[PDB]
Amino acid sequence: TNAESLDGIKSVIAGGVSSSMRAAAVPLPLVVRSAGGCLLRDVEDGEIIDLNMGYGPHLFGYADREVLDAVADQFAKGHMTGLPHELDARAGALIAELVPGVEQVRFANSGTEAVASALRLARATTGRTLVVTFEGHYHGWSETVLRATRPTDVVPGALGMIPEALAHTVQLGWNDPDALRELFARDGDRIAAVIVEPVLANAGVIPPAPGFLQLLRELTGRSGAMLVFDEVITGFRVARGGAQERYGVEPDLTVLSRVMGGGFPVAAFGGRRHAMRMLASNEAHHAGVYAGNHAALRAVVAMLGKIRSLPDLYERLEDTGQYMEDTVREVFATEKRPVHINRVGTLMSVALLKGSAEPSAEPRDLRQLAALVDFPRHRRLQTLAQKEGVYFHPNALEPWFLSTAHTRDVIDKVAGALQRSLVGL
Amino acid sequence: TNAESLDGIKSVIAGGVSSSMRAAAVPLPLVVRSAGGCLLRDVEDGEIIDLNMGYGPHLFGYADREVLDAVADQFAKGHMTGLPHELDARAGALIAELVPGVEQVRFANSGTEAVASALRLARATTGRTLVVTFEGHYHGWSETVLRAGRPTDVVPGALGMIPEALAHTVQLGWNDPDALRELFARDGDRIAAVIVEPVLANAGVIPPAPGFLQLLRELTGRSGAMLVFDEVITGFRVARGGAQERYGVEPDLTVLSRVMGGGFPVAAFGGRRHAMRMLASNEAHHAGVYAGNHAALRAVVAMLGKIRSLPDLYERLEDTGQYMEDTVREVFATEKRPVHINRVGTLMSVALLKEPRDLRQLAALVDFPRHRRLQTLAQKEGVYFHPNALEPWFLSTAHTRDVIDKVAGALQRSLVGL
Numbered sequence: 001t002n003a004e005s006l007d008g009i010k011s012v013i014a015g016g017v018s019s020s021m022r023a024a025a026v027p028l029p030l031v032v033r034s035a036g037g038c039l040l041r042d043v044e045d046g047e048i049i050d051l052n053m054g055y056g057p058h059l060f061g062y063a064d065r066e067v068l069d070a071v072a073d074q075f076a077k078g079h080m081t082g083l084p085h086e087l088d089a090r091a092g093a094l095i096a097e098l099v100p101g102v103e104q105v106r107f108a109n110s111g112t113e114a115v116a117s118a119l120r121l122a123r124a125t126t127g128r129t130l131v132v133t134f135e136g137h138y139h140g141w142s143e144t145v146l147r148a149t150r151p152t153d154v155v156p157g158a159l160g161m162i163p164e165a166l167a168h169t170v171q172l173g174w175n176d177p178d179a180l181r182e183l184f185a186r187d188g189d190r191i192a193a194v195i196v197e198p199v200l201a202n203a204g205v206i207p208p209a210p211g212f213l214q215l216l217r218e219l220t221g222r223s224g225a226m227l228v229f230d231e232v233i234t235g236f237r238v239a240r241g242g243a244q245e246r247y248g249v250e251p252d253l254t255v256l257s258r259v260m261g262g263g264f265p266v267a268a269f270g271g272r273r274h275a276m277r278m279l280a281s282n283e284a285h286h287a288g289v290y291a292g293n294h295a296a297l298r299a300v301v302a303m304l305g306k307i308r309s310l311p312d313l314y315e316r317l318e319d320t321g322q323y324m325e326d327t328v329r330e331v332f333a334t335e336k337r338p339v340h341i342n343r344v345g346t347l348m349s350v351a352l353l354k355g356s357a358e359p360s361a362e363p364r365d366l367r368q369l370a371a372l373v374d375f376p377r378h379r380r381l382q383t384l385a386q387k388e389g390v391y392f393h394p395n396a397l398e399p400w401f402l403s404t405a406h407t408r409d410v411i412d413k414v415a416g417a418l419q420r421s422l423v424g425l
Numbered sequence: 426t427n428a429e430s431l432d433g434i435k436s437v438i439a440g441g442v443s444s445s446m447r448a449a450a451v452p453l454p455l456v457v458r459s460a461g462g463c464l465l466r467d468v469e470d471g472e473i474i475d476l477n478m479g480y481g482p483h484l485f486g487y488a489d490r491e492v493l494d495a496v497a498d499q500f501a502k503g504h505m506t507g508l509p510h511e512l513d514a515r516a517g518a519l520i521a522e523l524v525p526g527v528e529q530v531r532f533a534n535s536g537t538e539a540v541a542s543a544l545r546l547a548r549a550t551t552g553r554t555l556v557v558t559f560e561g562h563y564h565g566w567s568e569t570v571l572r573a574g575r576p577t578d579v580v581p582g583a584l585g586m587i588p589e590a591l592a593h594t595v596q597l598g599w600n601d602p603d604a605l606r607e608l609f610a611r612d613g614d615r616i617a618a619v620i621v622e623p624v625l626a627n628a629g630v631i632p633p634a635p636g637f638l639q640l641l642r643e644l645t646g647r648s649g650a651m652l653v654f655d656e657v658i659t660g661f662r663v664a665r666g667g668a669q670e671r672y673g674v675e676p677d678l679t680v681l682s683r684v685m686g687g688g689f690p691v692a693a694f695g696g697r698r699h700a701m702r703m704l705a706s707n708e709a710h711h712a713g714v715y716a717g718n719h720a721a722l723r724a725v726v727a728m729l730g731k732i733r734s735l736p737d738l739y740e741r742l743e744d745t746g747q748y749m750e751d752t753v754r755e756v757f758a759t760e761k762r763p764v765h766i767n768r769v770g771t772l773m774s775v776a777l778l779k780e781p782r783d784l785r786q787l788a789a790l791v792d793f794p795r796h797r798r799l800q801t802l803a804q805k806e807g808v809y810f811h812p813n814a815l816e817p818w819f820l821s822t823a824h825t826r827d828v829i830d831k832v833a834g835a836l837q838r839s840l841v842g843l
């Protein structure tokens with residue numbers, strides 16, 4: 001059984017899962033035996049349609065052979081030597097072609113690593129130390145950015161961090177231009193970087209308000225602060241060239257992962273030659289014995305090569321998302337359950353609202369959205385859905401990540417499963 | 426050409442390599458086209474015997490099919506879902522079986538990640554903040570440990586670190602029991618952890634002095650400080666159960682990577698249930714979307730499964746190292762070049778000179794410009810090792826007698842050109 005098999009896992013993995021968040025993501029136990037397309041198989045041989053999809057990398061679904069095969073070939077030809085390799089130029093060139101604001105990169109194993117070195121690059125380059133974040137925006141778990149009352153409160157996110165960890169890190173509310181302007185008027189000249197999820201995906205899928213990214217680019221440019229887009233989720237997802245392209249605003253540095261490597265552990269950060277100058281001279285720092293290994297860069301080449309070869313991909317993904325959005329709206333409407341749904345392409349939040357919530361609200365930030373949401377009922381809904389054979393994360397603020405494997409028929413099954421689950425609510 | 430192909434790489438990879446250290450590791454350009462066994466193939470189709478081997482993971486050489494095949498099978502069956510998986514228990518159990526001081530683990534993508542979370546666990550568990558390191562010991566590049574690289578001076582290792590990064594990190598010289606005793610007599614009660622390379626591999630291969638690890642275990646135990654063995658390099662390398670087993674001293678936490686995943690990006694940290702209690706309750710923190718992904722844990726299961734099935738492996742690896750050691754000594758003796766060589770199994774340091782117990786003592790004997798010159802010459806003869814004398818060689822089962830005999834010839838020829 002799932003529950004018994006999870007208990008077995010817990011006797012050797014402290015907490016049941018390596019990541020503290022993802023260990024609370026299966027309150028009705030589910031242990032995977034295999035996966036393909038958008039389908040999981042249980043250790044009880046149950047089939048589950050996955051709307052979470054391993055948190056963003058799988059644009060084409062699980063077990064994508066066009067990418068498996070390339071990575072497996074690399075295992076047969078040397079996957080990790082630590083030396084420069086012919087692939088390094090091909091990976092770099094693909095990223096540069098597809099991403100406007102990137103001409104050079106360095107690779108890492110994870111978004112967390114890529115962010116930490118990107119922030120260091122901004123501090124080293126500007127000779128400043130102060131970094132600005134937004135509430136609910138997640139940039140991995142490195143010591144200077146790991147945050148958990150006002151949105152300007154900076155609260156450490158983990159036990160066992162040094163007390164000064166966040167001394168040079170500051171926070172504002174998402175989509176609050178007045179607050180942002182006031183900050184820059186006071187401290188624009190001390191800011192090394194503003195880091196931001198151009199679309200906030202780790203706390204609902206709150207897109208930026210009209211003009212907000214433009215405003216950020218202006219203030220940062222005027223003040224000499226580097227603008228860092230964390231596109232770990234949005235890159236190669238909301239458009240071929242990420243949110244950068246979709247919203248027509250170019251940052252100084254860009255962090256990438258997820259879709260880039262199709263699920264292989266790999267990330268990068270980069271920008272134009274000017275922003276990357278201290279790394280071109282090897283004066284600034286980045287490291288990691290596995291960084292840019294040959295298997296990882298084969299995965300980038302195969303995945304970005306595949307995406308490049310499909311010039312109408314993002315149009316079809318958009319139809320997929322629209323159809324899921326329309327279907328899920330009908331199912332909740334028919335049941336007379338208020339719901340909030342935000343979508344940017346195949347990135348999608350679905351949250352069940354309180355009976356006392358304003359159905360027509362368009363929250364612009366995490367606090368506004370959280371307040372409308374009925375968390376206990378949503379948790380209860382996802383247990384029910386999981387039993388009906390559909391998995392999404394129990395926290396309403398955690399997004400769904402659709403894929404080309406979520407065809408019309410799949411989405412029609414999802415509808416049925418959600419309908420049945422709501423009736424049990 | 427190698428040089429032209431590297432220049433192409435540098436137009437899109439800032440600095441030519443993603444890691445700031447490994448971008449200075451090929452001053453005579455070498456770009457890889459393919460690799461297998463202990464052999465590299467150039468973009469000019471040259472063959473090079475690799476003594477560096479990608480910095481530790483490849484105990485059986487490059488392109489190990491018994492491990493390729495398992496990982497490729499995982500790609501066909503779902504490699505990354507973010508959910509608990511049947512493999513998780515098998516990977517955990519294999520580590521627990523092979524490593525004395527580990528009963529539970531969490532996985533990470535890299536030694537740097539695994540270290541950071543391990544140190545946080547020790548701070549959270551003890552309610553203390555102060556961490557002790559040793560000079561020349563490398564624990565990755567996280568904010569609270571990245572030092573440059575007196576022995577007591579704590580110097581930041583990267584530009585753009587917050588100024589307070591190392592405020593709660595302290596350093597002593599390796600193998601200095603007096604200093605270590607004095608530290609603990611004064612501050613034993615404030616120390617959250619002592620982190621240490623049980624064999625110092627990133628600065629020569631300086632093993633611990635007789636009784637030093639035993640002393641560390643006693644002081645940390647007495648003071649309630651967690652002893653953290655960074656076995657990223659030594660684990661499954663110097664013995665099946667790492668330096669832990671080899672030297673009979675058990676730490677509170679162990680960090681693992683490298684050999685564990687056979688070159689797949691994967692790491693872990695773990696200990697006995699007591700030391701891992703705040704992670705069992707999910708009160709302490711670790712994260713990363715790719716942590717413990719199915720491909721990574723398939724690699725751990727295949728690699729550790731293979732090692733487990735070969736109970737005399739570490740004895741054969743010892744013969745391999747002895748033969749390399751004896752051969753290299755003869756070649757330098759015959760040429761009348763003084764050399765310092767330290768070895769622990771297949772971990773091996775070879776430095777050209779102008780028994781040190783620490784980095785300062787060893788560095789002082791070494792002729793760095795001549796060693797750099799020697800490695801350019803060796804590389805041209807078809808043997809690659811890192812140009813810095815303090816960076817170790819990582820031998821493998823693919824370094825057979827014939828290979829080592831070729832290495833001898835190539836080193837002889839290179840010394841004559843010195």
Ligand SMILES: CC1=C(O)/C(=C\N=C2/C=C(C(=O)O)C[C@@H](O)[C@@H]2O)C(COP(=O)(O)O)=CN1
Nearest residue numbers: 019022055110111112138139140232712713714
């Ligand atoms: C925008 C963004 C992220 O979303 C991000 C990681 N996000 C997630 C990590 C989770 C985890 O570690 O278990 C789980 C997911 O819920 C989440 O999106 C990271 C950190 O990446 P990584 O997990 O590879 O360290 C950086 N930037």
Ligand SMILES: Cc1ncc(COP(=O)(O)O)c(C=O)c1O
Nearest residue numbers: 288289535536537563564565657
């Ligand atoms: C002992 C030790 N620990 C940790 C690391 C860091 O692991 P990674 O390079 O995967 O971050 C290294 C790299 O040289 C190492 O030698």
